[PDB]
Amino acid sequence: ADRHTVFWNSSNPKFRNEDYTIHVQLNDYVDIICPHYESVADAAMEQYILYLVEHEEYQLCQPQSKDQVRWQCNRPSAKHGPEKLSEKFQRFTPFTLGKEFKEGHSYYYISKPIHQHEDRCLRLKVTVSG
Amino acid sequence: KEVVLLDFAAAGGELGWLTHPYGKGWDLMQNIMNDMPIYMYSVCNVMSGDQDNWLRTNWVYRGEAERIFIELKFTVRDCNSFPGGASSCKETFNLYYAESDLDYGTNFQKRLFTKIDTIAPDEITVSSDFEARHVKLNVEERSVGPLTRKGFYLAFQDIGACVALLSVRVYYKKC
Ligand SMILES: *[C@@H]1O[C@H](CO)[C@@H](O[C@@H]2O[C@H](CO)[C@@H](O[C@H]3O[C@H](CO)[C@@H](O)[C@H](O)[C@@H]3O)[C@H](O)[C@H]2NC(C)=O)[C@H](O)[C@H]1NC(C)=O
């Protein structure tokens, strides 16, 4: 009713069109859920760096800099459950390294695999309505 | 030597502190600082008038502790830096505590809490600090004593400020 779930993995069919976009309101949460396993081989477990980027980096599906690193899916078999990035679409942050989100704007996530095949570009468009 | 009873930053975001009112005030936020994954409780209800938001730590077993020392690290945003910015913007928050024999779990009654002090930033985060990605991290310490009951909670009350709490460290000194 309030939070949106995205399964960030290369088997998620929603990424196939590369038009994957979800619509949120201010103060909605997006829960990006990292690949998670409890047995395939360690090397087969999907791992990603998530970036939060501007439109152009989204078009290229490539990060511009370290500053854009949002989170890391580098715990594919954590016992405590899947690793999870919970982004609240606030208008204002007290934290100077975080992002602010505005009504009528769109925001963009991309990933890169951690030392693995990039078969397909994984990206997400989040549009704030209002 | 210092014996640590609570260390938020060390817990890797697994702590799950109670907030009140339910799902309205403080939120657990996540970020990258110094190329490391970090967590913080933050609140920024500066446009909404009268705010009364509580973050309560989990119950801390006292043991042999008599005087505890509480180390807070946090940021606070310049009330001037809000496009709107109602005269309901504050630049402080309050630190409370309560002693208990048992863990009350999901029960939270504010009036059981005693105010320790108002917490104010030495360094205010200004709008230019955003494009410069400059984190001005305040450090504040308080102590309460003598503790007498089997355990205690700390709580943080926001009254309409834009705050991010990055660290909460409680310890006593042995000898
Ligand atoms: C990769 O993304 C997949 C989604 O495209 C994800 O599959 C999803 O797995 C979750 C939880 O494991 C399922 O959620 C449901 O789980 C059970 C099913 O009855 C119930 O508790 C709930 O109804 C709950 O919503 C999804 O149904 C499932 N979706 C699909 C299409 O299979 C994978 O788990 C992700 N893979 C990895 C490696 O993490």
UniProtKB/Swiss-Prot annotation, chain A:
Disulfide bonds join 34-73, 61-121. GO terms for biological process: angiogenesis; aortic valve morphogenesis; axon guidance; cell migration; cell-cell signaling; central nervous system neuron differentiation; endocardial cushion to mesenchymal transition involved in heart valve formation; ephrin receptor signaling pathway. Glycans are attached at residue 9. Brain. Down-regulated in primary glioma tissues compared to the normal tissues. The soluble monomeric form is expressed in the glioblastoma multiforme (GBM) and breast cancer cells (at protein level). GO terms for molecular function: ephrin receptor binding; signaling receptor binding. Keywords: Angiogenesis, Cell membrane, Disulfide bond, Glycoprotein, GPI-anchor, Lipoprotein, Membrane, Secreted, Signal, Tumor suppressor. The keyword Ligase does not apply. It is found in: Cell membrane. Induction: By TNF and IL1B/interleukin-1 beta. Undergoes proteolysis by a metalloprotease to give rise to a soluble monomeric form. Its main location: membrane. Residues 2-130 form the Ephrin RBD domain. It is a lipid-anchor; GPI-anchor. GO terms for cellular component: extracellular region; plasma membrane; side of membrane. Cell surface GPI-bound ligand for Eph receptors, a family of receptor tyrosine kinases which are crucial for migration, repulsion and adhesion during neuronal, vascular and epithelial development. Binds promiscuously Eph receptors residing on adjacent cells, leading to contact-dependent bidirectional signaling into neighboring cells. Plays an important role in angiogenesis and tumor neovascularization. The recruitment of VAV2, VAV3 and PI3-kinase p85 subunit by phosphorylated EPHA2 is critical for EFNA1-induced RAC1 GTPase activation and vascular endothelial cell migration and assembly. Monomer. Homodimer. Forms heterodimers with EPHA2. Binds to the receptor tyrosine kinases EPHA2, EPHA3, EPHA4, EPHA5, EPHA6 and EPHA7. Also binds with low affinity to EPHA1. Belongs to the ephrin family. This is Ephrin-A1. It comes from Homo sapiens (Human).
From Swiss-Prot, chain B:
Induction: Up-regulated by UV irradiation via a TP53-independent, MAPK-dependent mechanism. Disulfide bonds join 44-162, 79-89. Residues 2-175 form the Eph LBD domain. It is found in: Cell membrane; Cell projection, Ruffle membrane; Cell projection, Lamellipodium membrane; Cell junction, Focal adhesion. Residues 1-175 are annotated as: Mediates interaction with CLDN4. Expressed in brain and glioma tissue and glioma cell lines (at protein level). Expressed most highly in tissues that contain a high proportion of epithelial cells, e.g. skin, intestine, lung, and ovary. Autophosphorylates. Phosphorylated on tyrosine upon binding and activation by EFNA1. These phosphorylated residues are critical for recruitment of VAV2 and VAV3 and PI3-kinase p85 subunit which transduce downstream signaling to activate RAC1 GTPase and cell migration. Homodimer. Interacts with SLA. Interacts (phosphorylated form) with VAV2, VAV3 and PI3-kinase p85 subunit (PIK3R1, PIK3R2 or PIK3R3); critical for the EFNA1-induced activation of RAC1 which stimulates cell migration. Interacts with INPPL1; regulates activated EPHA2 endocytosis and degradation. Interacts (inactivated form) with PTK2/FAK1 and interacts (EFNA1 ligand-activated form) with PTPN11; regulates integrin-mediated adhesion. Interacts with ARHGEF16, DOCK4 and ELMO2; mediates ligand-independent activation of RAC1 which stimulates cell migration. (Microbial infection) Interacts with human herpes virus 8/HHV-8 glycoprotein L/gL and glycoprotein H/gH heterodimer; this interaction triggers EPHA2 phosphorylation and endocytosis, allowing virus entry. Receptor tyrosine kinase which binds promiscuously membrane-bound ephrin-A family ligands residing on adjacent cells, leading to contact-dependent bidirectional signaling into neighboring cells. The signaling pathway downstream of the receptor is referred to as forward signaling while the signaling pathway downstream of the ephrin ligand is referred to as reverse signaling. Activated by the ligand ephrin-A1/EFNA1 regulates migration, integrin-mediated adhesion, proliferation and differentiation of cells. (Microbial infection) Acts as a receptor for hepatitis C virus (HCV) in hepatocytes and facilitates its cell entry. Mediates HCV entry by promoting the formation of the CD81-CLDN1 receptor complexes that are essential for HCV entry and by enhancing membrane fusion of cells expressing HCV envelope glycoproteins. Belongs to the protein kinase superfamily. Tyr protein kinase family. Ephrin receptor subfamily. This is Ephrin type-A receptor 2.
